[PDB]
Ligand binder design. Sequence first.
Ligand code: HEM
Length: 212
Amino acid sequence: QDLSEALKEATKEVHIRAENSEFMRNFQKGQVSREGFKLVMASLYHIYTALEEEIERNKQNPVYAPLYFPEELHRRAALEQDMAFWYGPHWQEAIPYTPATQHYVKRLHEVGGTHPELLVAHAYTRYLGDLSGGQVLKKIAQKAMALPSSGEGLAFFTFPSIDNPTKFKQLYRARMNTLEMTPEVKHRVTEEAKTAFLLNIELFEELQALLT
Ligand code: HEM
């Protein structure tokens, strides 16, 4: 079985649970507010910064190299633009760094520095989601908060270097399937993907508590 299919099958259950977290449930209903949106986007800024720092550290490592697509996928630059939009010129000293966000970042650094063969699980969890349901979330946010079609405030959800997300997603999956795989690695990669989803659920649960 291809790694791309194994990951989808391994995370379809936790994905349903993630969609139904209180925060995401409210988001989908279009009940997302500026306060809550700023919290999630600031948290993602920290998460993608860590993820991409680890991707750079392992770009030449065969256990990840086939998935090195910084021009097309990396989100740090986009999040920096969004932070300036939502938090202003001095966003760097204004954005929050929640405990759940810190925990996620911690695991990313452990994986990138000690278990790089599992980094693909984290890239899969974040990037393939961004190219999929992330586009649905983008539309909901635009409608709920009156964000312009021009993209301001939603750079994170925009991929100017990718003509068609569906096509790129198929390419990314194909390259994922070229990674040298063994039962050992496949087993652990799918397990780490479930952990990545849980880290996201825990973040959402925390943000919801901060909002309520
Ligand atoms: C607000 C709740 C969410 C909505 C509306 C949503 C919706 C979707 C949709 C419509 C797809 C495409 C399904 C398909 O092609 O069969 C998808 C796939 C995906 N989502 Fe989400 N999603 C949500 C939250 C999340 C979260 C929290 C994560 C984890 C960061 C996530 C990660 C993924 C991944 C990795 C994929 C790609 C699956 C694959 O093709 O292998 N999603 N999502």
